[PDB]
Amino acid sequence: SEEPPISLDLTXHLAREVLEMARAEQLAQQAHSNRKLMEII
């Protein structure tokens, strides 16, 4: 019910998944896509 905030702490760790991976995949798509468009113009 009330517990140590276990899910949150673990989210602390796997933020390297859902924030670093997510943010990286965004930077990747928005690098290469943007750089393709930019490379065109």
Curated annotation (Swiss-Prot):
Isoleucine amide carried by residues: I41
Expression by tissue: Produced by the hypothalamus and placenta.
Taxonomy, superkingdom: Eukaryota
Coiled coil: none
Function: Hormone regulating the release of corticotropin from pituitary gland. Induces NLRP6 in intestinal epithelial cells, hence may influence gut microbiota profile.
Subunit text: Interacts (via C-terminus) with CRFR1 (via N-terminal extracellular domain).
Name of this protein: Corticoliberin
Lineage summary: Eukaryota, Metazoa, Chordata, Craniata, Vertebrata
Gene that produces this protein: CRH
Residue range from the parent sequence: 154 to 194 of 196
